[PDB]
RNA sequence: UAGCCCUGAAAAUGGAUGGCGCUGGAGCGUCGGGCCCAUACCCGGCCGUCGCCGGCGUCGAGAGUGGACGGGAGCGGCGGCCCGGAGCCCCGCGGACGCUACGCCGCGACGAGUAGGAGGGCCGCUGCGGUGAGCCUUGAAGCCUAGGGCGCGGGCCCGG
RNA sequence: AGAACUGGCGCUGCGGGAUGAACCGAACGCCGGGUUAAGGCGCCCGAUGCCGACGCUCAUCAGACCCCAGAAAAGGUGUU
């Protein structure tokens, strides 16, 4: 997967074909993060084939709908569990973010795994994402925003070069 | 403004540059007449960029405008009065030339017979006295 | 078999009057069926962690 | 680019004869008029046989012609052949059939016209039957030549029957090894 | 080749029903527009007659 | 699937192709099918004597789909004016070459 | 434990992320929306080739995807005193181009090329048989030419 | 040095790889408008002169894009 743009949470269910041996298969369900629902119903068969004896020929999906959050305005803390690949071996990883939505924090993970650990999006498997409540966070960068009456200024502001004239007689103050 | 033929279209020509032979600037034992290059390693036959172009049938001119003179006529060189009279029923589409061997005595008479017959001659005032 | 039970099933459509279409077709795309999750709710599965 | 084809797009038939015979050139103008205008398939076979070569228009004898007109149904038709009519010496009497050919030979049009038949060209064929109605267009035996018995697999392959190019027939001329099992082998 | 979907009356040479499919979707989106312009008025009208 | 991009077209995608880029073959010639005659004069043996009846067999795939599809010359489409993405990997993998199942409609409108 | 960075890390003309340079990036990773241009793709022109044709109806009188006469019976319609019957053009004597059939026209698809193979040449050189009631001391051939042109080209014509 | 399968080069120009037989796109009649592929968009050099997003990194030998043109084991209370 390329994880192009912001990601998007999907609920995908599906079940294997009803054989003459087995009628009514159990119809499993997953939680896929993908940029569109064609990739999402492809990522469903990547994980289901790793856990059950199902594949796209001998199964189908019976729902692929975008599930999205019941509070896009509340600020939430997300702790997520990872299974990325490194150059030497593969690792388990816990990781905490802070965003207004589930899909925007997992997008913030793939940007961060590429930034810190150089881990490409085909090599990292999200295990579970859930919103966690404060005083159960363990990452002190997320923890330092838990402050009622939090305050800081903006130091040393820079933007808008060449738009405001390339050639001016005016040394631009950085506040 | 002499005899003003029938409908003259806008002559496109696809090229006005007279294809020259390769390595003909460099020698004078090589005339400018086109020969196509048949060498195994040269760059004009193998058609690299920025080099001497080579003719093909794609440069050919429009069939309704081929052999048109810049005045709008199509020449037909004559030698006497009698084959100037063969150009009577085509005088608004074709024109006559007097050949270079016709003497100034006989060229004087066949340049007046063409004016009666309303034929444009392309060299009317050649070899005057 | 499907020249024997095809010639005779051709002449069953002449006594009964129909258009059985005895030529075989490949596997068609699947019909719009209807699945049922009666009683329960679907199973949430998730990828296992890595341990050697 | 569109494909990777190894071109056979130029079909290789004849759209005109290679002859400069100005009397065959007027038959072509007559029949390719009648080909594209009368809406019949007789006149298209006769038009394409006039384009053919001297080899592809083999001669037709008199006793293939009257043998293919003793048949049931042919009792009043005309035998059109694009090619010459010769006569067998083998045949003894001739019926009063009506023929139509390029170039009947002189003894052939004497024995036809003794019996009371009629000889035609392709000009008065069109005036008689423009559609070609009631015609048996006959052909000559085009693999009857001396050249086709030299054509085949190879004269020295198994069973082969292929007649080698020897310069003279006889003993001591290509008869020794490869042709009998004693001297060497036999194909 | 003049283009269908770009000029009329070439479509109507290929499809006569294209015209009556087209004024039916111009008659109704004029009356769905006259409804919604009047309804958006009809809220703030008496909301102003309140004030 | 390395060489093709494909998917399932909706009603106005098949509508836009037959009108704007639709051409027909009769014998060997690629004609503009700008008449309801030329569809009936050849493919009228199958009851699909007009343009929009040719569009009905090829969207709601019917009995004479094969003969109606072979009648159409393959759509010589224009270059995609939005650009593409990577052209050499799969549509799932980030590129475009493969099945995309309703997103081919967004590409046809760029192609056509 | 693994990302970047560093140590390990030494070659002879002066030197190479291509250079200049680059550190709120002009570096690395993960993405976005714009934007740039191939002889590729789409639309149009023109050239050739190939495929399938058309037109001998120059038929301003030709008209025919069905056709006539003349008799046994019925109308709608043309002129009534409800009985009814072919008119061959003419007040205009008229009406473009064409089709070297080896020609002309139409439509569609195509066009890399060594070795090699075919075709076309109204490309060119020398000589012959015919032919232009050809050309010329009122200036031929040849040569020269910031002259004018034609042909995709081979080449050619004209002016001086 | 020698095989297998397929594609190429040789016989082949063009766009990109600074450069180039073989890499990546794409194959070529002569042009006009449109669009793209691979590849890019400080300035050479057409195009980010976007108020682009998020981090990682300081080197007294930084790093910088398929083939492809330079490095390993080991090690660092250097930072993440
Ligand atoms: Mg070479
Ligand atoms: Mg050669
Ligand atoms: Mg590849």
For residue E24, the surrounding DSSP H or E stretch is helix E17-50
Asked if E13 and F35 come within 8 Å (Cβ–Cβ), the reply is yes
| Strand G close to B83 by CB, under 7 A | yes
F40 contacts F30 by C-beta, under 8 angstroms: no
Q: Which two tokens stand for residue C7?
A: 């010639």
Which residues precede chain breaks (C–N over 2.5 Å) in chain A?
A: none
E12/E7 Cα distance (integer angstroms): 10
Q: How far is the CA of E27 from the centre of ligand 1 (A)?
A: 72
Q: CA B93, CA B72: separation in Å to the nearest integer? A: 8
> Which position has the token pair 């039916």?
E24
Among candidate residues A122, A102, A97, A125, the one with its CA nearest the CA of residue A112 = A97
Spell out the residues 6+ positions from residue A35 whose beta carbon is closer than 8 angstroms to its own: A1, A2, A3, A4, A5, A6, A7, A8
DSSP code at position A24:
S
State the Cα–Cα distance between residues A106 and A112, nearest whole angstrom.
10
Q: Where are the alpha helices (DSSP H) in chain D?
A: 24-35, 42-50, 62-65, 108-115, 122-128
**Which sign does the torsion angle of CA A69, A70, A71, A72 carry?**
positive
**What is the per-residue burial (b if ≥16 Cβ within 10 Å, else e) of F27-66?**
eeeeeebbebebbbebbeeeebebbbbbbebbbeeeebee
> What are the two backbone dihedrals, phi and then psi, of residue A64, each rounded to the nearest 5 degrees?
-140, 95
**3-class secondary structure, A9:** strand
Q: Is D106 exposed, middle or buried (0-12, 13-18, 19+ CB in 10 A)?
A: exposed
Euclidean distance between CA atoms A54 and A46, whole angstroms: 10
Alpha-carbon span B36 to B84, nearest angstrom: 40
Round to whole Å and give the CA distance between A71 and A101. 8
Residues of E whose CB is below 8 A from F11 = none
List the beta bridge partners of residue A95: A80
**What distance in angstroms lies between residue B42's CA and the mean position of ligand 2's atoms?**
15
Probe site for chain C from A127, A129, A130 (most C CB atoms < 10 A): A127
Q: Collect all residues with Cβ–Cβ distance below 8 Å to F78 and sequence separation of at least 6.
A: F111, F112
Q: Is the Cβ of F84 closer than 8 Å to some Cβ of chain A? A: no
User: B101 beta carbon < 7 A from strand G?
Assistant: yes
Residue A94 has what DSSP assignment? E
Element (H, E) at A77: strand A76-82
Ordered DSSP codes for chain F? --S--B----HHHHHHHHHHS-EEESSS-EEE--SSHHHHHHHGGGT--SHHHHHHHHHTT-TTHHHHHHHBPP------TT--S-SSS-TTTTS-SSB-TTTHHHHHHHH-
**Closest approach of chain F CAs to the CA of E25, in angstroms?**
16
CA distance A126 to A84: 8
d(CA D9, CA A144): 78
Do D32 and D44 touch, CB atoms closer than 8 A? no
Residues in CB range of A91: below 8 A, 6 or more apart: A82, A83, A84, A85, C50
Angle between helix axes D42-50 and D24-35 (nearest 10 degrees) is 150
Resolution in A: 3.1
Cβ within 8 Å, pair E14-F20: no
Is the CB of C49 inside 8 Å of chain A's CB atoms? Answer: yes
| Token pair belonging to F64 | 């004479």
CA distance E1 to C37: 55
Q: Is the dihedral of CA E20, E22, E27, E28 positive or negative?
A: positive
Residue A163 pairs with which residues in a beta bridge?
none
Q: Do F52 and E1 touch (CB under 8 A)?
A: no
Asked if A97 and A75 touch (Cβ cutoff 8 Å), the reply is: no
The answer to whether the beta carbons of residues A136 and A119 sit under 8 Å apart is no
Which nucleotide is closest, CA of B107 to its C1'? Answer: G138
Q: Edge-to-edge strand order for the sheet containing A93-99?
A: A93-99, A76-82, A126-132
- What tokens were used for D70? 């003793």
Q: What is d(CA B98, CA B102) in angstroms, rounded to the nearest whole number?
A: 7
Record: contact E5-F19, CB cut-off 8 A = yes
Long-range Cβ contact pairs of F89-94 (< 8 A, separation 24 or more): F90/F1, F91/A38, F91/A39, F91/F5, F92/A1, F92/A38, F92/A39, F92/A42, F93/A1, F93/A2, F93/A122, F94/A1, F94/A2, F94/A4
Q: Do chains D and C touch (3 or more CB pairs under 8 A)?
A: no
Which residue in the block uniquely carries the two structure tokens 């170039």? D103
The answer to whether the CB atoms of A29 and C47 lie below 8 A apart is no
Q: Which residues contact C42 (CB under 8 A, 6 or more apart)?
A: A13, A26, A27, A28, A29
**How many CB pairs below 8 Å do chains A and F form together?**
19
Q: How far apart are the first and last CA of chain D?
A: 51
Residue B124 corresponds to which tokens in the numbers above? 């009317």
Please name which ligand lies nearest the alpha carbon of B40. Answer: 1
- CA-nearest of F23, F18, F12, F22 to F104 is F12
Collect all residues of chain F within an 8 Å Cβ-Cβ radius of residue E13.
34-36
F85, F92, F102 ranked by CB distance to A39: nearest? F92
């Amino acid at each position: 997967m390329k994880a192009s743009g912001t990601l998007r949470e999907y609920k995908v269910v599906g079940r294997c074909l009803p054989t003459p041996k087995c009628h009514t298969p159990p119809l499993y369900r997953m939680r896929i993060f993908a940029p569109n629902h064609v990739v999402a119903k492809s990522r469903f068969w990547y994980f289901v084939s790793q856990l059950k004896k199902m594949k796209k020929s001998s199964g189908e999906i019976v729902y692929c709908g975008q599930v999205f959050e019941k509070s896009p305005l509340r600020v939430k803390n997300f702790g997520i569990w990872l299974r990325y690949d490194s150059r030497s071996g593969t690792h388990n990883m816990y990781r905490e973010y802070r965003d207004l939505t589930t899909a925007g924090a997992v997008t913030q993970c793939y940007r961060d795994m590429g930034a810190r650990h150089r881990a490409r999006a085909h090599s990292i498997q999200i295990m579970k994402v859930e919103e966690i409540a404060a005083s159960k966070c363990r990452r002190p960068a997320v923890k330092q925003f838990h402050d009622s009456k939090i305050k800081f200024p903006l130091p040393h502001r820079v933007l808008r070069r060449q738009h405001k004239p390339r050639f001016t007689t005016k040394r631009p103050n950085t506040f | 403004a002499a005899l003003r033929p029938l409908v003259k279209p806008k002559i496109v020509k696809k090229r006005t540059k007279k294809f020259i032979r390769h390595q003909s600037d460099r020698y004078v034992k090589i005339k400018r007449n086109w020969r196509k290059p048949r060498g195994i390693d040269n760059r004009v036959r193998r058609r690299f960029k920025g080099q001497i172009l080579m003719p093909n049938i794609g440069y050919g001119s429009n069939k309704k405008t081929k052999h048109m003179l810049p005045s709008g006529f199509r020449k037909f060189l004559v030698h006497n009065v009698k084959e100037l009279e063969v150009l009577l029923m085509c005088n608004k589409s074709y024109c006559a030339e007097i050949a270079h061997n016709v003497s100034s005595k006989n060229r004087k008479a066949i340049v007046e017979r063409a004016a009666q017959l309303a034929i444009r001659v392309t060299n009317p005032n050649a070899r005057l006295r | 078999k499907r020249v024997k039970e095809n010639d005779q099933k051709k002449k069953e459509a002449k006594e009964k009057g129909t258009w059985v279409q005895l030529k075989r077709q490949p596997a068609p795309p699947r019909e719009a069926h209807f699945v049922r999750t009666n009683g329960k709710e679907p199973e949430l599965l998730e990828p296992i962690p890595y341990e050697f | 680019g569109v494909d990777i084809r190894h071109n056979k797009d130029r079909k290789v038939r004849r759209k005109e004869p290679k002859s400069q015979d100005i009397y065959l050139r007027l038959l072509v103008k007559l029949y390719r008029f009648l080909a594209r205008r009368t809406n019949s398939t007789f006149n298209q076979v006769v038009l394409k046989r006039l384009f053919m070569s001297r080899t592809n228009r083999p001669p037709l004898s008199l006793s293939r012609m009257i043998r293919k007109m003793k048949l049931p149904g042919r009792e009043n038709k005309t035998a059109v052949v694009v090619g010459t009519i010769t006569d067998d010496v083998r045949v003894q009497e001739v019926p009063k059939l009506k023929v139509c050919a390029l170039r009947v030979t002189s003894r052939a049009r004497s024995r036809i016209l003794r019996a009371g038949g009629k000889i035609l060209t392709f000009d008065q064929l069109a005036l008689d039957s423009p559609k070609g109605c009631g015609t048996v267009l006959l052909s000559g035996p085009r693999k009857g030549r001396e050249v086709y018995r030299h054509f085949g697999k190879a004269p020295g392959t198994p069973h082969s029957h292929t007649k080698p190019y020897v310069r003279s027939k006889g003993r001591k001329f290509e008869r020794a090894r490869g042709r009998r099992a004693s001297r060497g082998y036999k194909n | 080749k003049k283009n269908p979907l770009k000029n009329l009356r070439i479509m109507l040479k290929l499809n006569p029903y294209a015209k009556t499919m087209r004024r039916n979707t111009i008659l109704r989106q004029a009356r769905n527009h006259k409804l919604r312009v009047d309804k958006a008025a009809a809220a703030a009208a008496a909301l102003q007659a309140k004030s | 699937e390395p060489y093709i991009a494909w998917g399932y077209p909706n009603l106005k995608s098949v509508n836009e192709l037959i009108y704007k880029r639709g051409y027909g073959k009769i014998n060997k010639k690629r004609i503009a099918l700008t008449d309801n005659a030329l569809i009936a004069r050849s493919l009228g043996k199958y009851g699909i004597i007009c343009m929009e009846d040719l569009i009905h067999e090829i969207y709601t795939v019917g009995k004479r789909f094969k003969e109606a599809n072979n009648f159409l010359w393959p759509f010589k489409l224009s270059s995609p004016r939005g650009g593409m993405k990577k052209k050499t990997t799969h549509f799932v993998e980030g590129g475009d070459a493969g099945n995309r199942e309703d997103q081919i409609n967004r590409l046809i409108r760029r192609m056509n």
